[PDB]
């Protein structure tokens, strides 16, 4: 069961936080979550890893991943979204044991609109 990444289309006003939810279950307690934006070259650019001990040293603070209380839903928030954050995003869920598996969500679109 690959993770779900919702909403499929998210429209936010520039300056607001843009918050997706990455969801997955039926996986072991030993997991890693990755948050990607699709680049102009159709390449996955890693925005954030969860938990914190998986983060690249230069991970930008504006990409916030929070595990919600039920432990299966995760908020993935762009803090103070800008017009140029408009694009395509997805999450990857990695199970580590007893079998290691990588599964990507379907892509979701973010549109960040002009504030009037």
């Amino acid at each position, epitope marked *: 069961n690959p993770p779900t990444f919702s909403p499929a289309l998210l429209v936010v006003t520039e300056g607001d936080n843009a918050t997706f939810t990455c969801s997955f279950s039926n996986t072991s*307690e*030993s997991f890693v979550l990755n948050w990607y934006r699709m680049s102009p070259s159709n390449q996955t650019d890693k925005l954030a890893a969860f938990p914190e001990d998986r983060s690249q040293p230069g991970q930008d603070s504006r990409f916030r991943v929070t595990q919600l209380p039920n432990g299966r839903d995760f908020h993935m928030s762009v803090v103070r979204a800008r017009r140029n954050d408009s694009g395509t995003y997805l999450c990857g869920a990695i199970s*580590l044991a007893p079998k*290691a598996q990588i599964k990507e969500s379907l892509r979701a679109e973010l549109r960040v609109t002009e504030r009037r």
Partner: antibody
Amino acid sequence: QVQLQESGPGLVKPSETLSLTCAVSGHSIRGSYFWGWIRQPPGRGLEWIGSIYHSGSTYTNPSLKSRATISVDTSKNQFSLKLNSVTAADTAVYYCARDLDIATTRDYWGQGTLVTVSS
Amino acid sequence: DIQLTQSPSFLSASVGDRVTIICRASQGINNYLAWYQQKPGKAPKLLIYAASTLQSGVPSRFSGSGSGTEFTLTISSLQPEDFATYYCQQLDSYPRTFGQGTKVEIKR
């Protein structure tokens, strides 16, 4: 980065229990990684013994499941190996490690400790 | 469980030679395989992960290729300091397994 150090007796009598501890430095065992024991008999290959998550959930080599216990003490940032009923076949350098996985770029190994099984 | 067949067992090659080491997995494991260098009296040291990704800081003469069952470690230009036993490790599942190892000695 991360440093690991094996400790325990270098000489165990046949039929007794081998006990080793791994002291982890530079980062907490509490986290998203598995922590493993690997051994190498003199001049032979690497054999994975078992691994443990900070929660205490373990995986053990099927060949050693009857004799081997992996344990973790997050209170002391250590994990440990007990191997019962030792024989000359158990003479080896014992390594503790942060297990490599497909979600990282790096692992970490102790220097290894020799255990000789002899009367 | 994953079994690994590593070949060859031992090789002697000259400084500057291209060295080829192979690990065959008992079933498809995607690119979930790592290559290690073990110098005598030292812990195994990671060279390559995800079958073909050189760990940043490892010399560029080390490369990996393959996905599924057949994995290749290449040393493009053998150096005297490359004397070691090389091991593959599968990362596909517990129980963890290593190749039998390839001992590399320098012909001079």
